[model samples]
Target: SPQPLEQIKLSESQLSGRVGMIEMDLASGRTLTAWRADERFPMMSTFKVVLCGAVLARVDAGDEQLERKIHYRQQDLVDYSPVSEKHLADGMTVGELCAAAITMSDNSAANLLLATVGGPAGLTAFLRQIGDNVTRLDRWETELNEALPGDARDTTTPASMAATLRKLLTSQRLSARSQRQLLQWMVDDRVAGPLIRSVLPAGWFIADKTGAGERGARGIVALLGPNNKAERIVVIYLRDTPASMAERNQQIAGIGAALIEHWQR
Candidate 1:
């Protein structure tokens, strides 16, 4: 592709869906590429990253501990809760829950953490506290992924998501230890990591969270760089498409390819 923007536009046209994206320097908060960056898209499982950030913030404030164990029964289970379902017998630590939710995209684990952070409204409040006015989490799992046409619930704009992620990872709002923990969780991502790694040029690094929902909505928020160090923040979201999952994956990967080819110095 000639440019990252061109690749994003091409993918949008081919998928017949709106694509929202923003690529920014992780250190300087400078935007490198933007497409419909202000428009809202369903967050899906990508919210888990921010959810874990909220938990980390509480931990830094001495309100919570990573080693704290939470026990839940089958009643708490939600769909696609692979990691959490298996841990019901012994429960999982807060840190382990973050791993299951961020890396494994475990729905039940996310809901448990969401409850700990005081639900969707509480997370939205957390966003507001961090100076992000554009992102909001208004529903619980499964329901939040509805991606209903014209509904703004459980939605976030690419620009806002990138800004918030930058703050959580680099800003002083969270302690150094908490920030590192958050980054490590994303670095451990398994959902979109394999494909993103496959598409990028050798030596590039990626840490990400992926989401999917109704109406062909899909998204990924990531930290990417070269030589195994995260250098930039990339957020991409798709909504209102009728394409299959495979096509969506390829389109997103195409956008990633464009980034690799045209990355700024």
Candidate 2:
């Protein structure tokens, strides 16, 4: 009942600013990509996904444990972090940190994880080891700004994000338990907006992460469960979107809705 992949493209004329996207069908190994899918964009908090990967990869290597407790001081707290703001005093486990980072986009939790693994270099090396050459987490979350001196603020392409997601799914780089745990954490994400969730039918599963900034960067990377037995992944990134938050989500949702309808037809 699926339609041609080409039918999933969004109307460029109706969209503002540059957009990047990729959709991959797990059942058929077929993919649909936009021209800018390979173009680099500021990852914002979407970089947390890679951060999650690096941490889990370490766990896969016997170098770390998910239940390991990590202590955080008040200084570790950063703006825009709700969970960390309250939990820093109590400390948390690595698994808890990962959950907060991915599900709540908790900056302090993310930084703690990044620090736990030896900072951005650890992430970059882990990504390379996993065959991801197109994404990088070059700086800590607290150091990021709308205008940075360099690619210091995490960077990735839509194609790279989608490809990395596929690699995690297909390659045995991670233990099955770790993979399932990671996906479940993403599925538990509480930060996604209507743009990524509105298109889902009841009972459908979506493991996704979203990121946004006042500078007009927004994005989501997701594994969508079309049925109990089949899955697909989608990555969408928009840069310099001039629209308001409501309008931006609408424009982005329009694309997701179209993709769902076409794929479900």
Best by TM-score: 1
* Location of the lowest summed lDDT over 10 successive residues in candidate 1: 191-200
- Candidate 2 regions off by >4 Å? 1-12, 27-29, 145-153, 193-199, 228-230
The residue-by-residue lDDT of candidate 1 on 110-214, one tens digit each, is 999999999999999999999999899999987999999999999999999999999999998999999999999999888778866776778999999999999
**Candidate 2, 60-94: lDDT as tens digits:** 89999999988888976887787878766678889
lDDT of each: 0.93, 0.74
What is the alpha-carbon RMSD of candidate 1 to the true structure? Answer: 1.0
**Where is model 1 more than 4 Å wrong at Cα?**
none
Clashing pairs in 1: none
State TM-scores per candidate. 0.98, 0.88
